[model samples]
Target: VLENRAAQGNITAPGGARRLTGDQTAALRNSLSDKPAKNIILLIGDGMGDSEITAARNYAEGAGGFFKGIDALPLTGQYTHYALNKKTGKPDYVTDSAASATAWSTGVKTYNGALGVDIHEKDHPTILEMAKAAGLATGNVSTAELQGATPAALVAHVTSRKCYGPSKTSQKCPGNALEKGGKGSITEQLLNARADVTLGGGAKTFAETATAGEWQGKTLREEAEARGYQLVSDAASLNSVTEANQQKPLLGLFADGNMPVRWLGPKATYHGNIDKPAVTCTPNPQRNDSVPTLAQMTDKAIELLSKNEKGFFLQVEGASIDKQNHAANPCGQIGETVDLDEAVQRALEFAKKEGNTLVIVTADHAHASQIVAPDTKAPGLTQALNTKDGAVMVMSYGNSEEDSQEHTGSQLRIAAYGPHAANVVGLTDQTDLFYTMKAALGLK
Candidate 1:
């Protein structure tokens, strides 16, 4: 059972409404279990570092406010997330989404731009692929294009993350090109990988004709239809679908590019915090009802994938946190984090109902955003926001003075619930997550 006092805006009274009313030692003891998990749902918030999470929590909720979704996970830990140098094979310290995602998806460190491949360009079967091979239902959902680095790592293996379609593969990763006798492209590999449920943007890439394949002249959408895929373009069409399986997998492409963010605000500028009034976040005018929220996608995915007798392995990503952070938009990143928190709530609901499921929430890597004093003038960029607590919170991104901010080299937080969740406790490497999930699902 859950209780909600709403708190009206603030809960400042001492222990007036704390997250933990009493000691959780007994609850913690009861939550620990070594049993295997039948299903695994991994939720990733791209570039959702501690700062991003804290800022989101501070803005949407209050300084002491707790998120029923994001903060509800009982077990938490930290993990290393450095990528590797392609030639030197040494730690690169910082990581891109592709390589960081690959670390957990395939249990191997890779070059920054690589997808499901190691430093030496060797292919590693991803957890999604392994789950499919072992007869488990699989799904991949994201706010970004299905071909984005985070999603691509699970379904495609290429030397460059830019190798999305045939053209890019040919130009960027010649060795992995179809005409060159390697795996065609990320889109091609996605078709071949065939997860039971795939939902995201990147519909435009499907319009590109297969350059050198069994359906060379046909567009990817045509090929998908020919392959018995049930392609749904809008929320109505997606909701109408009743089944997703090996014969007729569900493919939901809601947008041509990365989906529009939930909220919009002014981008951070040098000395903006001091020059401008603190603003509140508002819903993005561009986002329409046709685009399903991450929570809706996760709910439908779990409902469909749970039907499989052999269980499932699904990866859900709130991809725009990093994209927004790179653009130095504090409201944008916070909105995406809140969106992801809702998705995490959905997963937690299912995992709680089905005790055999394991739900993990973490990020690919850290990003460049920090909460600074409202009067502090940042050298790079800064924006002051009026938070729910009626406080002015100044967000700063000082990593870059250029157009785009950069990702940070920091350990990330990983939290979990359900069976085998304890393994996420204490310090672990990103690669260790792959093994934890593999072992939980009992996949060889």
Candidate 2:
């Protein structure tokens, strides 16, 4: 750590001189060889394929701006997104966020909906768990509910994607039953997981109010607070956290299901046109008002995670990007893509200033969608698939899920901006990320 800090002095501008920022200097230094990363920050755009990122980048640059964080990276690679079906012992061909994330988090491939476990239903230790055992602080932030497939894969072990909190019904959720044998519900397990920073939406799963038949018990929210987490559930309360009070651990839940998509801000017009889905921005029942942007949540998470002196590992997810695609909502994907780009900016800025964090921007998997060329404009990037510049490219859903809105085996990009970035290049597999980060962090 001292050598890294000492090396920062080398980039200093003497007298009235100029100096490269920490990230820039580190990029120049680590691009050629492997080195242990003092910190790790992974930013995932859940369904962000090469096309989605290009759409957002073109939209922003065309608007006379930039995608500072994601686009500023120095090492770039493509990774395949497929997993073992377990039952068939064949490639699933496509992977859901659960299995994809598990591959990256555990360095193992499992069936879709599998969380932190391998194809044989064996629990694999995750990067976060390993980080904690190594004495590093950890965090996970998402735009989707904290208990969703992506976030759940990072911290919890489960049999099915649907198991969030434990079951109140006599018939237990598959993963929640000890006899059935899994780490229990993702949310229930989260209360005891290795993470120190947890921020996202999913109040229903964490709330005390029993919806009569689901479960009758103290909510995960209450349970988290009991475990000494500082609970935050709104924009104001979340914003209220500053460096002064960042020493304590945090848990922030902002919505009933997924947090409202605030990419369009406080409000947007809905055309109520299902036929011309491109013309509608608020087609989904997205939340407004009190919710925070993914960038804001990411910033808050970083501040809290950084307080740990042992260095940290943080995952900030653009969760809604994938959720939107599953519903064949192209505009929804665009909105969330922009939001993710902003979060990437935040992560990059943090790495730039801190100098020790290895910042990576990537996707868990790619779905079938694109912003059509004719739709390549501001409104197209923001509201529809067509901008004033023409129409942004987008792929429409076809007859079968395989050819339509489902996750695909398409390769996705991985951009790294810190130590050991030299390790990511050429075509790679999803499981490679776990070892890449492990190697970067010198974790065995």
Candidate 3:
């Protein structure tokens, strides 16, 4: 589709295949071999695919400027979507988000619901851990709970991704089901790992036993502070930290669950009010908390990470895409994508200023929904239908009791913009993320 569009001269750019200077060409080759990357930023849009992202483009900017936040990126290659059990002769042909994220973070294929665990069920080191061991700063940021599969895979290893944290119980101490033998949760691992910066939701998981009255132990925020991290819970505190001495590591938690979806947060005002009442019939069904936007989080992460002399590895996720997909909320989904795009725009701006950062943008898996052609009755009302570049339309499977809205088996899209993005083109496996980052950073 892209090639066809380019052939028709629909895709415009500064130039086509300009000759590289002898010095520039030599520098490129030498850098590829020598590795000059000082920082890496991996941005994953969970449960998003080509169609979903493109739908965001159309909804936000129409056909003319459809590629708003991501237009600056160099189009990477397509990624093949499949799981180990699904690819072989197994009956299950679809992959879940956990398996896909595990593939990318650990460079190993495991069963669904597993995190950083190999097919043999043995825990293995993750890219984040490896980077930490190498003395590089590492961080994971998401709009989802910090312990969710995608972010947890970076520094966690467990047979089941569902073991997010501990259950709420206070009676059992030594054999406490809630405490889980005091091994702590993935959030604990992240804080103890000395991740330089951590941000996202899941405050409830870290609440002290006294506060929650059920779970016992110090909160992850307290752990982070004890480790010398500047802990901040709200947007105000975050801003204050930026201005203060920021030499220490930082942890920011904005909500109790996944941070309210961007649309439900401050960005909702951009869209007009819908006459249709919400499920509750509240005057304003869309109103939610007014918190720091994703763009704000991205900017702060960049600022704090850039201060690290050893460089940093930061993973930023636009998490609500999956939630919106699960609810089959097209408007909400597209809004969140645009919100992510805005965050991406901030990252790109930072990259332009500091030329050594490698930014990778891709999705874990595609949502099953496809954008179908619009109906004749909706003619000239292209905006009513979600699309990208006003050419591609969006549609999804209707919800049913047997099968709720869920992840689908579709080819995922990988867009790269930065030093190593050129290598991202073509249909490739999720394991390629490890090699891509490692090669970019000169890691073996």
| Candidate 3 segments whose C-alpha is farther than 4 A from its true place | 1-34, 86-92, 168-183, 208-216, 219-221, 243-247, 264-290, 376-394, 399-403
Better of 1 and 3 by TM-score: 1
What tens-digit string does per-residue lDDT give for candidate 2 at 343-440? 88888888878887788889988875554433333221223444423444334433233413567678889988777876677888889999999988
Please give, for residues 280-314, the per-residue lDDT of candidate 3 as tens digits: 11112443444667788888888877776877788
lDDT of each: 0.92, 0.70, 0.64
Best-performing candidate as measured by lDDT: 1
Can you give the TM-score per candidate against the true fold? 0.97, 0.81, 0.78
What is candidate 2's local distance difference test score?
0.70
Task: List the lowest-lDDT window of 10 residues for candidate 2.
Answer: 1-10
lDDT of 3: 0.64
lDDT, candidate 2, at 58 = 49
Using lDDT as the measure, what is the rank order of every candidate, best first?
1, 2, 3
- With candidate 2 superimposed using the best TM-score fit, by how many Å does residue 30's alpha carbon deviate from the native? 6.8
TM-score, cand. 3 vs. native: 0.78
1-444, model 1: which lDDT tens digit per residue?
122323433355765555555577887888998898999999999999888999999999877777788888888999999988888889899999999999999998899999988887899999999999999999999999999999999999999999999889899999999987888789989999999999999998999898876899999899999998999988888888899999999999999999999999999988989988888999999899888999999999999999999999999999999999999998899999999999999999899889999999999999999999988967889999999889999999998977999999899899999889999999999999999999999998
